[PDB]
Design an enzyme around this catalytic site. Structure first.
Site, PDB file in Angstrom:
ATOM      1  N   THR A 109      -6.771   6.037   7.858  1.00 18.46           N
ATOM      2  CA  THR A 109      -7.170   6.254   6.769  1.00 18.46           C
ATOM      3  C   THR A 109      -7.092   5.403   5.641  1.00 18.46           C
ATOM      4  OG1 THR A 109      -5.077   7.163   5.965  1.00 18.46           O
ATOM      5  CG2 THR A 109      -6.568   8.782   6.715  1.00 18.46           C
TER       6      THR A 109
ATOM      7  N   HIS B  97       1.615   9.080   1.919  1.00 16.01           N
ATOM      8  CA  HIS B  97       0.706   8.916   0.789  1.00 16.01           C
ATOM      9  C   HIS B  97       0.868  10.201  -0.213  1.00 16.01           C
ATOM     10  CE1 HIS B  97      -1.985   6.661   3.295  1.00 16.01           C
ATOM     11  NE2 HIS B  97      -1.568   7.194   4.173  1.00 16.01           N
TER      12      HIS B  97
ATOM     13  N   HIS C 119       4.629   6.799   7.676  1.00 17.23           N
ATOM     14  CA  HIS C 119       4.369   6.328   6.282  1.00 17.23           C
ATOM     15  C   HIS C 119       4.034   7.511   5.542  1.00 17.23           C
ATOM     16  CE1 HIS C 119       0.713   5.750   7.967  1.00 17.23           C
ATOM     17  NE2 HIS C 119      -0.002   6.126   6.817  1.00 17.23           N
TER      18      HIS C 119
ATOM     19  N   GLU D  12      -3.870  13.473   1.532  1.00 20.73           N
ATOM     20  CA  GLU D  12      -5.215  13.019   2.165  1.00 20.73           C
ATOM     21  C   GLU D  12      -5.919  14.001   2.750  1.00 20.73           C
ATOM     22  OE1 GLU D  12      -4.210   9.252   4.552  1.00 20.73           O
ATOM     23  OE2 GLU D  12      -4.690   8.232   2.599  1.00 20.73           O
TER      24      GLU D  12
ATOM     25  N   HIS E 113       2.672  10.903   7.695  1.00 14.08           N
ATOM     26  CA  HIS E 113       1.692  10.430   8.823  1.00 14.08           C
ATOM     27  C   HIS E 113       2.815   9.898   9.977  1.00 14.08           C
ATOM     28  CE1 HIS E 113      -2.565  10.164   6.842  1.00 14.08           C
ATOM     29  NE2 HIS E 113      -1.788  11.270   6.792  1.00 14.08           N
TER      30      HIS E 113
ATOM     31  N   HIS F 208       0.954  -1.325  -0.083  1.00 14.10           N
ATOM     32  CA  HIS F 208      -0.066   0.059   0.071  1.00 14.10           C
ATOM     33  C   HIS F 208       0.787   1.253  -0.075  1.00 14.10           C
ATOM     34  CE1 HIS F 208      -2.788  -3.138   1.699  1.00 14.10           C
ATOM     35  NE2 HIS F 208      -3.320  -2.611   0.674  1.00 14.10           N
TER      36      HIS F 208
END
Length: 257
Positions: free
Chosen positions: A195, A93, A91, A103, A116, A61
């Site tokens: 999330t 996004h 991590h 996000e 995050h 992911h």
């Protein structure tokens, strides 16, 4: 299983995880005009001097930078928080292009990426117990914009070639997460969720106002990662963000005027 595509992406998650349609889902759009300054909020205390990173993981992911959370070594306190929250992992996004990837959004603006830093409330003893509690986690969210390189990110970028595909990990010791923070710790805060599945409604979100800068070359290295495992058809790890969810019955509070 869940992911970010057309057939398995965010609009599908509710079928396996019905809380996806819950009352306190994340991320959200931060409307800066309606977030109210709360003079009762404290400065955030970020104490990362003794943090002990161990490993970086491609989980299919994103990639996770993991910490030793077996003592109070890297803790978040203050701000909106009661008690002590221990760093377990960070991590990101990110997008396929610099115009998307975050996000949270700020007045509908999407950043190129979002970091995050995930911390769990020590009063619940372990992470798995913490995520079952409405105050179990505190996540520090930091936006990334593309401009100047972030020198404290380069060690992460360096290693990504070794974890290209899902299920690959590598030793990642002695990495200092302080090098990922912006100058100011001004923030917005609200109650929300993880999330990614299982989307548990256990997070106090602390979203910093000031983005960090990373270079185009740094972000381009994130976009060479793969969601697939070794020797499977290549599908670039991009656009691994959940869009903004309904704010519902929540208030976003600002630490600053």
């Amino acid at each position: 299983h869940w992911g970010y595509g057309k057939h398995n992406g965010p609009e599908h998650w509710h079928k396996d995880f019905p809380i996806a349609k819950g009352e306190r889902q994340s991320p959200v759009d931060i409307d800066t005009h309606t977030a109210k300054y709360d003079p009762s909020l404290k400065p955030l205390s970020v104490s990362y001097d003794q943090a002990t990173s161990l490993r970086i993981l491609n989980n299919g992911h994103a990639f996770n930078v993991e910490f030793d959370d077996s003592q109070d070594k890297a803790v978040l306190k203050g701000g909106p928080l009661d008690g002590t929250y221990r760093l377990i992992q960070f991590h990101f996004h990110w997008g396929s292009l610099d115009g998307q990837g975050s996000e949270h959004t700020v007045d509908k603006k999407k950043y190129a990426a979002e970091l995050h830093l995930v911390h769990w409330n020590t009063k619940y003893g372990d992470f798995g117990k913490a995520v079952q509690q409405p105050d179990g986690l505190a996540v520090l969210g930091i936006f990334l914009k593309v401009g100047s390189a972030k020198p404290g990110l380069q060690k992460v970028v360096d290693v990504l070639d070794s974890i290209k595909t899902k299920g690959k990990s590598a030793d990642f010791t002695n990495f200092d997460p302080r090098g990922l923070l912006p100058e100011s710790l001004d923030y917005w805060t609200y109650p929300g969720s993880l999330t990614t599945p299982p989307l548990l409604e256990c997070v106090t979100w602390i979203v910093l106002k000031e983005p960090i800068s990373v270079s185009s070359e740094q972000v381009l290295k994130f976009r060479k990662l793969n969601f697939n495992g070794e020797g499977e058809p290549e599908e670039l790890m991009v656009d691994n963000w959940r869009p903004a969810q309904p704010l519902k019955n929540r208030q976003i509070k600002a630490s600053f005027k």
